Symmetry: D4
């Protein structure tokens, strides 16, 4: 994949914990690599991108440079749909450490990914809860690529989406949605190829090959997708 | 794998979108990494710097493009053409006088391509079937993609079927796009081209699924696949064509 | 995953093999990359530079070591101890006044460690079986490796058997070596420790095979494995413990 | 894995095609990353390594900087068995290009790898040819780790070895050995985990799971090794 | 003497001859050495006796972007002229203006213009014998002031010519001072009569200008009014006080 | 003359005008050129870096000054005090993190001082004239300026003194006037005149060198030929000895 | 005086002592400081970089010299010829790839020249004396040195000339002697003397400035007061005009 | 004047006071500016009139490693002294010796010592009246030569004292010249009598040395022999030729 980079754009701002830092401000250096296929253009603007970055960077005084570096990434993805993966290093060479060094930097790195989430409900307006969820999901900026039809004391459905949130972060934002509708049932099923085993998340979801109703609605929107572990197209798993 | 690199070669030219730019020109800096096994050259066959730099600096100045991407890609595209030894290339084109009006170091575009072996299936069932296939494999050649090995074309209103093994540096999505472009420019059934495998790779995108999802189910595709590549391993089923064919 | 880095922090100290070095000391330069997900800190939890640098510069000067490796490793080892947030660390220690007598830039040693989840099996059939196991899991804790989850110990002259799930940054070969060192220092049957899995990893070296080659065949190991990690996937058999257990 | 690096050691020598270059000599800059586990030392010498490199580099005038960069790598592995993987960049900033640039470099990169090779013979002193082969192999600097016993109108055997030669280069050196004994039959079976499909080499060797005599002698020295494709221990493949 | 310096201030602007340059603009870099005696500021903690960078940099950067000049010399000269006007502490300048994106089409590090000026004490003889002799004189010292050269001390007038000599402070080098003298003469009907006498210590012998003016020690009415305002000033060639020269 | 130089020594401290700067501190870079004749050290005596850099760094961090000048001056002043070998010094203090909010390499202040030999005439005709004179040479010595040579003392009491100072002329002068003040200033008490400061020759509003009347005041030539009969008047291009025979 | 400077312009060429160097060529870096008064350009006249750099680079590559000096000198010489605005020039030629086999940043040669005003006395008392004189001023003009002012011509025939040259004194002299040669050198033909070159004042084995006898040769003061009666003798500290009334 | 310069030659050696430094050695960097008139070499393609770098660098680097000195000044002074001996083209030096691994234990860029010397014309008066007056004189000019100072011109001797003045070339600054004068006096039983008269143009007034020597214009036998070897040399203070001063 091709990349566009901006190396070491200088920025003055007022970020830092100390209220003296917020008062004097200091120099910050930004560097980013944006990845996407250039083959079509060969066969984004710099001035603009730098201008926006430089606007976004000074709208406020954050306490943490992490928080600013992340805002830039998030807003870059919102404004340049072309971009697939971004890596932004934010450097703070005047940090008040009192030692000699070249610099301290925080670098945040995010990649658009395709995922499938299962929704279920069985109390209240069973289907109202399903729609509210795809909505809350859309509101968080995650894109809804493709949704299945919904199946009839429970209602189910699955959704294909696109997000730059790492798996664990997606999961957290899924649980936050469960909360803010009073605890529905959202499950991350796959996020691409990926396969994890952490305390809070197993990918792919450990029961997919044994839940007919999940394979059902999964096979409707993604009959050819391969299960990264069983090495089989959904279409086929559904056949047993 | 081993690498030759040219770091920060300086070049003046006149690319840019603004007409003021095409008028004054500006400094550009080029860097590249070319990869290929040097074991043979080192032990007895290799690229020359003076020439490589000299050529790049010619191709770079031939014209003014609007976008530096387009110039970076051209240099990559032709380097591959002129130095078949090279397997993988990564070329960064830096534009440090870009008219941003802020302090930075530089703003660059870097294009990265690698040769890959791929298998594409051809089918025709109207007209001079067998010539439609030939003209497709020609368009392929003409777009710089290399025909490594080609099966024989069998009759399967019958289909002429064949599969071709090729070497190309176009990324998967791009190979596909050029495949469709070729279907178009021979009347869109006239020919069918399918991307079956590009090496080991496995993609699931809106436009391309690799490997192609019906390979293990299409005797006529395993037919021709098995003739030229019986030991190639299906990256999903984790079996040799040869074996998949025996059902 | 996101990263904090400290680039080129300068430090004077007295490490070196030569006694002339311990006497004059020299300049050293430290650089590191610490990795961990910053999404939570950025959105509501994070490391501080001033402190991190200040600590490193204390631990660096506590003593004179012979070898810079040993100082680099100490900084890594303690950074993990003091900042559990950190998942992966890569620390470069540059020694640009090294007494080589040739012109260069610098000569550095860089040590790189990542936390990993691993499963280790314990067995005992002599003495206070159940205490031998406890003391092993203690030695483990005492060497800084973390006990994440531990199965129950079952009787299988019977064996006490158990398996433990742990988090450690020691590379596979090193985990093993410390496993054997623990067998030694409790009388070498007193206890058996086996490395079963370290994540996804699969090695075949003279001293260690991962995953351990008999896991799918030892009901008593799947027993305890299935109790704490039934969904973990065997990286070879490409199945969940749970399933391997059902035979 | 940990690394030791030397950045930009300067060297004057007489390498180049032009006989003017051989005459005046010029400056060369060397940089290397040597990888091996440091955990044992923490719980190689620089002065020496630089001195040797700098000796080896000036013993001769090669035409190609590639050839010198490779000599250094090869000799480094011979002299420091500890080293597992090496990456040496040789830079030629005075190259006679007549343009402005920072430098042109060649960088050669090699890693020790475990491989298994099958030997067969069936004409002449069947077993004499087998022994001559393991010898020729040892003479090329490849290490013999472990050899099986030899099986009885053919004689077979398999060998486990260690080499930093990339797969294709191993293969070439195998065919060179076949030649210099008058055309035996050496086959690369595995080189570690690796799996290739090139015109001259398929790894693993496409017939292993179907050759009882190969599995035989393979199961003797490596019953637990996993077939990177069939995902099975040799021991088990041999059982059918 | 002490020096305050600003190294490599970055500034984007639109200066140059080509109209494509005035359209895209380009990066310029500034570096200056301001000189003056910092001993009072260091010692009395005297904020008024030092220059504030932040503001220096901020002004320079404003004056720098007010307009698009054709030549960078013109812009560099402007900052020098303005600094002297706004920061009377400063005694001597040297300001370098770098143009690294200059459309040369070769590799280099940079091109740069660097203008260097120093405040100087000078003496100027004024005569008139035509129209309102009297008036001409005043209007000349005024024209002088108008140009920003400073009048330090003026002698009484000797009233068939009328005569005066003035002591002034200027940063313009001697040749330019002379030119702006002649400029005034002209913008006055060619009446007045201006002569550079000394500019400090200096002694030149060029086509347009001889310093000290070669007739001083023989012109009684010049000593007359020179001894009035600088009796102790020493003739750089004859090596004596005006005072004594006048006594002959 | 030879030079010893320390290039870009880094130092953290808390100097600055902004209270946020005292609070946070920033990086400062120091570079100095000390001049002195090294021929003597090189041939058998010299400065250490270990020490010079250690002290500078101590001195630089003892306090927090509002102006970096006052600090850069502190180091020049102190250095001359503790290293009498040094004859001329140039010390540049750089403030790369100055809160200007523009891109630049840096801002710096560089203070440059040189030891010089001067002659000061003292006069008194009021109170205890003799005392007056003595207290002036003392005040002077107190300010750190060195007394090299003093003439005998010559109604009015006169004297002239040979001294060594690194203060530039104008500043030497100011300090002369300040002494006159702190001693109370028709009849006077004291009169300090700068007579010469080396070779130099001025013409400014506040001071003229050499002082315009020397060649014409016998009392001055008197006590001045006594301690420096061979010194050459930078303008009349003659020895004092000689100007005195007239 | 203001300065225009071109910093580290890169140029490839084939200069050098080693035949392997002519054959292969190497990189050269050039930096120049041209001085001239910019006040006039800045206020309404100046040099281009486009051009200055293009020409320098042409000139630098026309030939292959054994010494980099001869090349660095070529650029100074030519520049003064094509840009009469320039008054002083300093041009440094760096040879980073010089075949020294040691680590260093670079070796360089930097040639520095300044326009100066001089006075040359001409005499002839043999052959066609008048002609002799005229051919000398011509030879001179040929060498590029400019004739600013010539006195009228005064057995022996005498003359004195005001000229402008960038040659340092000693080299001006050498060229004077060379002319004397190429015109044939009791009775002579020509006599060139360096009388003054500005303000300057020498004392070397080959040349003394000002020439030690001026104040004592009427014929010289004669033709010299005629074209420069106000010029000041750098030593006697008087106008020629005046020295002539004696 | 033109200049040849060698920038940042790297050299490893074993110089310093600590014995751990003499044991490990460390990196030193050298940079010099050699000055002389390159006009002959540029013009006549005159190889003998330029300095060869390769060799310069090679020698310096040999002399640099011959020994371990305690102080870097000593080593820097050595290269200066030796260069002048081996490359008579060179008129003026400045050689900087950098010690970046100096065991200071703070961040800096470097420490450095930089020694700067210039060939000069000087005049020295010799007198004796004791033992073999005659002999003393010769042995002194010889001692002079021995130190490497060069005898350019010596006057005839004026034979109750015997007297001579010599013209020489030295790079030692005036104070050091005086010291080595006194050194000779001593290594001769304190007989001889050496006086620095002028060293060029220069005029000093320090504790140990007044230049020009303050009695020249009144000492007939000094003018006597000075007018013999440099009649046109000009007294930097009285501004007249020795020749004329002697005529009184």
């Amino acid at each position: 994949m091709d990349q566009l980079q901006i190396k070491d754009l200088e920025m003055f701002a007022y970020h830092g914990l100390f209220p003296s830092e917020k008062e004097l401000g200091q120099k910050f250096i930004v560097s980013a690599i944006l990845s996407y296929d250039m083959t079509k253009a060969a066969t984004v603007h710099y001035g603009e991108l730098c201008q926006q970055w430089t606007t976004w960077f000074q709208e406020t005084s954050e306490d943490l440079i992490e928080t600013v570096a992340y805002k830039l990434v998030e807003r870059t993805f919102e404004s340049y749909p072309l971009v697939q993966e971004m890596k932004l290093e934010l450097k703070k060479p005047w940090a008040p450490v009192h030692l000699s060094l070249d610099t301290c930097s925080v670098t945040i790195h995010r990649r658009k990914q395709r995922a499938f989430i299962a929704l279920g409900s069985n109390m209240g307006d069973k289907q109202a809860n399903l729609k509210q969820a795809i909505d809350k999901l859309r509101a968080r900026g995650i894109h809804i690529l493709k949704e299945s039809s919904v199946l009839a004391s429970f209602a189910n459905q699955v959704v294909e989406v696109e997000t730059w949130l790492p798996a664990q972060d997606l999961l957290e934002t899924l649980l936050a949605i469960e909360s803010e509708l009073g605890r529905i049932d959202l499950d991350l099923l796959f996020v691409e190829d990926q396969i994890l085993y952490t305390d809070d998340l197993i990918l792919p979801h450990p029961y997919i090959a044994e839940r007919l109703f999940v394979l059902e609605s999964l096979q409707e929107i993604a009959p050819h997708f391969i299960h990264p572990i069983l090495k089989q197209p959904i279409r086929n798993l559904y056949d047993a």
